[PDB]
Amino acid sequence: SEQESVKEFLAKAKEEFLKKWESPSQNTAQLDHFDRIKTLGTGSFGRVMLVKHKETGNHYAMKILDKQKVVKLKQIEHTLNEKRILQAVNFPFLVKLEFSFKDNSNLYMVMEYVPGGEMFSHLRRIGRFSEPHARFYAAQIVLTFEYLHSLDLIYRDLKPENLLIDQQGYIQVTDFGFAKRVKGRTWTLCGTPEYLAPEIILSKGYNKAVDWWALGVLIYEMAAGYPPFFADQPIQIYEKIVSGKVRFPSHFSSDLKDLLRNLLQVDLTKRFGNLKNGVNDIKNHKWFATTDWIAIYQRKVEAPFIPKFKGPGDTSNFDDYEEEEIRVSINEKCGKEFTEF
Numbered sequence: 001s002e003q004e005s006v007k008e009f010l011a012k013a014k015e016e017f018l019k020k021w022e023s024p025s026q027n028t029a030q031l032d033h034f035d036r037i038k039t040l041g042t043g044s045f046g047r048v049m050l051v052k053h054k055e056t057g058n059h060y061a062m063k064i065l066d067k068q069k070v071v072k073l074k075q076i077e078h079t080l081n082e083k084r085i086l087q088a089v090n091f092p093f094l095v096k097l098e099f100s101f102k103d104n105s106n107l108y109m110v111m112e113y114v115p116g117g118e119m120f121s122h123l124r125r126i127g128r129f130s131e132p133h134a135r136f137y138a139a140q141i142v143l144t145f146e147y148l149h150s151l152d153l154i155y156r157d158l159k160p161e162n163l164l165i166d167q168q169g170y171i172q173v174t175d176f177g178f179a180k181r182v183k184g185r186t187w188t189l190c191g192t193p194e195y196l197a198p199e200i201i202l203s204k205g206y207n208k209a210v211d212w213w214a215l216g217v218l219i220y221e222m223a224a225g226y227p228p229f230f231a232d233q234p235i236q237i238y239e240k241i242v243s244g245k246v247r248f249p250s251h252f253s254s255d256l257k258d259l260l261r262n263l264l265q266v267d268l269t270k271r272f273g274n275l276k277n278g279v280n281d282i283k284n285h286k287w288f289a290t291t292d293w294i295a296i297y298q299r300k301v302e303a304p305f306i307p308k309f310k311g312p313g314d315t316s317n318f319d320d321y322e323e324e325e326i327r328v329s330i331n332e333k334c335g336k337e338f339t340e341f
């Protein structure tokens with residue numbers, strides 16, 4: 001079936017992941033080693049801030065999570081998943097975690113800063129991506145899932161806001177807050193409504209097939225400019241998702257429609273990526289006939305566009321948020337819950 005070079009690559013990738021997975025790094029910097037520059041984005045339990053390391057001058061994106069808000073939102077296991085996975089993975093299209101640490105109030109994950117901004121911004125600015133442009137990004141996600149799934153990891157948060165565009169025009173995936181190592185099935189209701197597979201919505205035990213469904217949603221959104229299932233109320237979105245009905249814009253190629261019908265298959269036992277040939281059904285589909293998979297992996301293909309930015313500390317591709325304190329309490333909070341962080 002697969003070439004021995006590919007099998008050996010993935011076998012070594014798993015060996016290296018498991019060594020770090022079984023002995024995670026902890027406490028590799030502290031807050032006063034950095035200067036704060038700007039808030040790059042916010043969220044329910046945390047935010048991401050551009051920082052500069054005071055000794056080296058290097059820029060980083062620091063994700064800050066409030067321990068008490070994490071406990072209240074029942075995200076303890078998820079935050080521990082995120083840091084433990086990020087410190088163990090290594091792949092060209094994943095954001096690199098450089099440091100992690102905690103204090104009395106917060107958990108900190110310090111990643112290399114990617115100045116080009118989120119794919120979401122670029123997609124909304126241009127309207128929609130041409131099929132070659134969408135296919136260049138989709139190929140990178142296919143390889144990333146091939147890697148992650150071979151490590152028994154499910155990603156569970158694919159969407160344009162989590163795909164950063166780097167200085168070469170390639171993707172780096174960020175936010176592993178829903179990622180998890182899974183042996184067979186898992187059961188948590190999590191994700192963004194527009195991207196949820198039917199089996200998540202229906203409260204079933206599910207597997208890596210949910211990532212391949214989300215790839216179908218992403219490719220549709222890149223090529224159309226909007227996602228296939230949307231509405232004002234989540235329950236209305238869920239009803240569309242489970243119905244098995246998708247309408248395609250007339251400008252979609254026949255090959256694109258065919259691939260999407262096989263990724264957006266409501267029956268998970270019939271969905272591309274989850275059949276006997278696994279990822280190969282996707283890589284060998286006609287829509288990818290022009291893709292040089294090794295060249296993509298090696299970053300040898302010229303990108304469709306390079307983001308405009310002035311230097312490693314430029315924030316122009318991210319937007320403006322109210323600047324709030326990073327307060328650290330005099331007393332430790334939730335120490336027992338986060339001992340492993």
Ligand SMILES: Clc1ccc(-c2nnc([C@H]3CCNC3)o2)cc1
Pocket residue numbers: 005006007009010143144146147294297298
């Ligand atoms: Cl997901 C993924 C699966 C397999 C490979 C792979 N198989 N052989 C290689 C060689 C050629 C380039 N340098 C190592 O890479 C890469 C990514």
Ligand SMILES: Clc1ccc(-c2nnc([C@H]3CCNC3)o2)cc1
Pocket residue numbers: 077340
């Ligand atoms: Cl409610 C709950 C459900 C599952 C787990 C769990 N699954 N694997 C683990 C590892 C890492 C931390 N300790 C052992 O914990 C913890 C709490």
Ligand SMILES: Clc1ccc(-c2nnc([C@H]3CCNC3)o2)cc1
Pocket residue numbers: 040041042043048061095111112113114161162164174175
């Ligand atoms: Cl390297 C890097 C640079 C920026 C970010 C980032 N900025 N905002 C976010 C959140 C909120 C919206 N989407 C996820 O993440 C993460 C990593």
